[PDB]
């Protein structure tokens, strides 16, 4: 009798997607992530930059 919009309340979000708790608690929109990094290229900077 009232639509709720599960990006409001949480309690309704968490009535859907039980995973949303996990997801919220571990944050996930965050996960560092990564990493010692390589590699630049060789030609793909030559071609690009011209």
């Amino acid at each position: 009798v009232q639509k709720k919009n599960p990006l409001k309340n949480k309690q309704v979000l968490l009535r859907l997607n039980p995973y949303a708790k996990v997801f919220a608690a571990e944050k996930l929109g965050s996960k560092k992530v990564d990493q010692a990094k390589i590699k630049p290229s060789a030609t793909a900077l030559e071609t690009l930059k011209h």
Binding site: T47, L48, K49, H50
Partner: protein, 169 residues
Amino acid sequence: FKEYQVIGRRLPTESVPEPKLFRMRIFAPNDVVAKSRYWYFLQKLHKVKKASGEIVSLNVISEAHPTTVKNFGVWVRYDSRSGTHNMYKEIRDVTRVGAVESLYQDMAARHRARFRSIHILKVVELEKTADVKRQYVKQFLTKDLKFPLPHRVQKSTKVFAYKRPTTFY
């Protein structure tokens, strides 16, 4: 604007895989216009069309040294009501993108030439002064350039004022 690189293959046919690849420095406002403008410029040089073909890579090229004032030579094919012309305008700007933005305005103001009329044929930072042919660039390449901004004007946020305004500067 930005200056997209756009690279495109054509497609692979049986018999001729690994095709020739092409590349254009498209001055397009976004990924999507890049991919048009690339194909619009391809379709005038080869027998390939967005259908019978593919983009390989968009890469947005950034200005190497974007706080250095440069004398950008630009060649332009622009289409008038009557007939289509070449050109060569020169633009003191701090990026290619800004130049080529500010060319399209300059074309539009001086030739009513819309973005859709103009091709940017080539753009070039001119190394030497002397290669700067145009007088209207040359002005600002003078040994010790000082100038005033006579007739300064103040944007009063209010309607009225009491002091009676001044253009001193």
